[PDB]
């Protein structure tokens, strides 16, 4: 048969890739960062509590000014909060209640949310009529959206449960690039700091490094034995971290093209819903569904701190661009902002 | 302190809170029914009987009660990733075609779906309203074809009533916690106006249990 020898060539390529990438594995990141002093106990207290949602929050996102944050919950509301004065700047009602992602534009003029309606809706915040209205609805993406993320005011990358990611042009409304190659549902997405490449973590327990320009998978990463729910670049743009339902986070580097560190603990048997790094990337903040967050020392895999202020599943978290705050939304309708 | 603009910002935020409480108490006084079941099982018959591209929402009013049915089966993905979004529905309207037993092991696939939904961790106490559809088709089909090719351990008369009660007994016995949740089995005709009445009567028990949970009495 021709398909059987073609699968033979595929597994031979996979064996050559695994041998070529263990040939560049000489020393673990534990063996390099064992002389490094640890960060000690990270004590972060809850500085704000944002209380306006009346249902489970699935998504927050910070602004680039580190003061405004958008928040999405199942009551059909996304609220834009002033994080300093605890005020509500905007309350935007959603055309579908089932919303599992939200993003805030890096200019700040737009928010965009999506869910089970299969549509990333984009809302113009800064209108001469004074209200927030829908600018575009990006239809045609045939699965629930898991994560949409802005590049500009005109470009946005969506991930979905039809195993695809996409690059859209907002003003024309039609998607310009489709990133295919996962076999499970793409659950999370994270853009690089230069935004010329991104990572997608999916339900086939593999994270793929995409490339926004030509539109195809540059590197592929395995190592999780369960479905990946969270993904986040390192601030250098060279590493990234995955979080999944086998209770481990994992660190991958793009140039070494392999696993470096597993953030696991035998007390933790629960899933991971959200990860983020700090500003220097020394702290990896993973939100779990044993109702709290852990702050891992990302170079030594100690568990440096526990953010334990929620009475349901931590579903989303985000660190500011300043690094001055961490917000943590959850399924008990409360954002907590920690410092 | 607060300047003259921060006071108006706080006043705007308070008025936004009043609109949020109004909308939240408007949506809290409403019944949310998750419509489920395998494909070609008369869910279209159900949504034309209550009222007359990922998730289809239907709003109807019956006896001073507002119902929202969510037909989520139009979109296909891994169900475990989005099934927690419907934790907190009032009832799960499951639909099973009775006359889809001799076609292809489709009744075994709908039993697989009922075992997945009914023993789920998110619907561990959510009541299920089970609608057995196409019962006139089941009546005209059970004379020529036997129920042995769907259920090999079935021993009984090949009439409507004993085999339909057997299919009920099989579907009732998929749950592992009979004491925790209720299953309300009904049979739809080709056309009858009593299915929304059955939904309303099963929802009234869930409303009574939620009112007792609201008053601390559980």
């Amino acid at each position, epitope marked *: 048969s021709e398909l059987d020898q073609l699968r033979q060539e595929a597994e031979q390529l996979k064996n050559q890739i695994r041998d070529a990438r263990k040939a560049c594995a000489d020393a673990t990141l534990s063996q390099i960062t064992n002389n490094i002093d640890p960060v000690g106990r990270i004590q972060m207290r809850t500085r704000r509590t944002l209380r306006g949602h009346l249902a489970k929050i699935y998504a927050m996102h910070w602004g680039t000014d580190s003061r*405004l944050l958008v928040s999405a919950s199942q009551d059909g509301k996304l609220i834009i909060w002033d994080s300093y004065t605890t005020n509500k*700047v905007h309350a935007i009602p959603l055309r579908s209640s089932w919303v599992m992602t939200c993003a805030y534009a890096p200019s700040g003029n737009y928010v965009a949310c999506g869910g089970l309606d299969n549509i990333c809706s984009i809302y113009n915040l800064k209108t001469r*009529e*004074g209200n927030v209205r829908v600018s575009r609805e990006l239809a045609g993406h045939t699965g629930y959206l898991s994560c949409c993320r802005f590049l500009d005011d005109n470009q946005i990358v969506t991930s979905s449960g039809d195993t695809t990611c996409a690059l859209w042009d907002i003003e024309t409304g039609q998607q310009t690039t489709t990133f295919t190659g996962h076999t499970g549902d793409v659950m999370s997405l994270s853009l690089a700091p230069d935004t010329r490449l991104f990572v997608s973590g999916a339900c086939d327990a593999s994270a793929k490094l995409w490339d926004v320009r030509e539109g195809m998978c540059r590197q592929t990463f395995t190592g999780h034995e369960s479905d990946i729910n969270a993904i986040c670049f390192f601030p250098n743009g060279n590493a990234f971290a995955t979080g999944s339902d086998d209770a481990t986070c994992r660190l991958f580097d793009l140039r070494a093209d392999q696993e470096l560190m597993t953030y696991s603990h035998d007390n933790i048997i629960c899933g991971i819903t959200s990860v983020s790094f700090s500003k220097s990337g020394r702290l990896l903040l993973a939100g779990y569904d044993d109702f709290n967050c852990n702050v891992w020392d990302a170079l030594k895999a100690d568990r440096a701190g526990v953010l334990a202020g929620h009475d349901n599943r931590v579903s989303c978290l985000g660190v500011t661009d300043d690094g001055m705050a961490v917000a943590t939304g959850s399924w008990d309708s409360f954002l907590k902002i920690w410092n | 302190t607060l*300047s*003259a*603009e921060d006071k108006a*910002a706080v*006043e705007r935020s308070k008025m936004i809170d009043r609109n949020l409480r109004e909308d939240g108490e408007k949506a809290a006084r409403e019944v949310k029914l998750l419509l489920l079941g395998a494909g070609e099982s008369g869910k279209s018959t159900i949504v034309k009987q209550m009222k007359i591209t990922g998730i289809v929402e239907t709003h109807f009013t019956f006896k001073d009660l507002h119902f929202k049915m969510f037909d989520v089966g139009g979109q296909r993905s891994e169900r475990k990733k989005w099934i927690h979004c419907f934790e907190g529905v009032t009832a799960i309207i499951f639909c099973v075609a009775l006359s889809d037993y001799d076609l292809v092991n489709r009744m075994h696939e709908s039993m697989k779906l009922f075992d997945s939904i009914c023993n789920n961790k998110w619907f561990t106490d959510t009541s299920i309203i089970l609608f057995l559809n196409k019962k006139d088709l089941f009546e005209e089909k059970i004379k020529k074809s036997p129920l042995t090719i769907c259920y090999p351990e079935y021993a009984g008369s090949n009439t409507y009533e004993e085999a339909a009660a057997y299919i009920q007994c099989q579907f009732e016995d998929l749950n592992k916690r009979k004491d925790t949740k209720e299953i309300y089995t009904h049979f739809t005709c080709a056309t009858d106006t009593k299915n929304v009445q059955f939904v309303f009567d099963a929802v009234t028990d869930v409303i009574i249990k939620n009112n007792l949970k609201d008053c601390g009495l559980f």
Partner: single-chain antibody
């Protein structure tokens, strides 16, 4: 976005008059309204303010007791009931929308004004007239009597331009931020009680009177008016 006012005319002193303003094309219930008047050859003088949803109503000390500002949101209309009018109430009355949240731009749209004819913190714009050549750069300063820098970091100074024969128009909100529809050739700077508006590379249709206003506390007070001429 359109605020058009009506209800002006001649009132015999001692009499009464209701001024009305109809709004068109913006979410009128989300906006606070101000009435700011202007005497026939004087500057702008703020009269009254009703909030969004009518929750907070302020007045000027010279009109307090005799004037009542009242909005009605389904008709999208604003009223000012004016009782026992004196001869210093002869003015042109302007309705102003202003919305207040983080990063907002209040006082951004002004109405066309009606002519009434009746038969704190001070702002000193020290220069009343500037001889201007087009193409050049013009700096316009004004003085406050109190530090306009609040503890939150905002220094609430507002620069308006009134082109001749028209309504005034927001150039800069909170001493440094350009309004929408305002070019980058306008810029503002300052410290507490000392501010300046610079116009680099001045062209025509910048001729007019420039007013600086405080929004630190009520009553809102304008400058006397710095006027450019070509």
């Amino acid at each position: 976005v359109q605020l058009v006012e009506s209800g002006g005319g001649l009132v015999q002193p001692g009499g009464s008059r209701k001024l009305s303003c109809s709004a068109s094309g913006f979410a009128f219930s989300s906006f606070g309204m101000h009435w700011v008047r202007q005497a026939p050859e004087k500057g702008l003088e703020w009269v009254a303010y009703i909030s969004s949803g009518s929750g907070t109503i302020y007045y000027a000390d010279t009109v307090k007791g005799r004037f009542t500002i009242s909005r009605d949101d389904p008709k999208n209309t604003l009223f000012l009931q004016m009782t026992s009018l004196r001869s210093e109430d002869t003015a042109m009355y302007y309705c102003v929308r202003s919305i207040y949240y983080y990063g907002s731009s209040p006082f951004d749209f002004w109405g066309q004004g009606t002519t009434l004819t009746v038969s704190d913190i001070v702002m000193t714009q020290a220069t009343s007239s500037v001889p201007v050549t087009p193409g050049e750069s013009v700096s316009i300063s004004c003085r406050s009597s109190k530090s306009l820098l609040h503890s939150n970091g905002n220094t609430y100074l507002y620069w308006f331009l009134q082109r001749p024969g028209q309504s005034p128009q927001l150039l800069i909100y909170r001493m440094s931020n350009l309004a929408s529809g305002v070019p980058d050739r306008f810029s503002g700077s300052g410290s507490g009680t000392a501010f300046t508006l610079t116009i680099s590379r001045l062209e025509a249709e910048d001729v007019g009177v420039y007013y600086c206003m405080q929004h630190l506390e009520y009553p809102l007070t304008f400058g006397a008016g710095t006027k450019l001429e070509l």
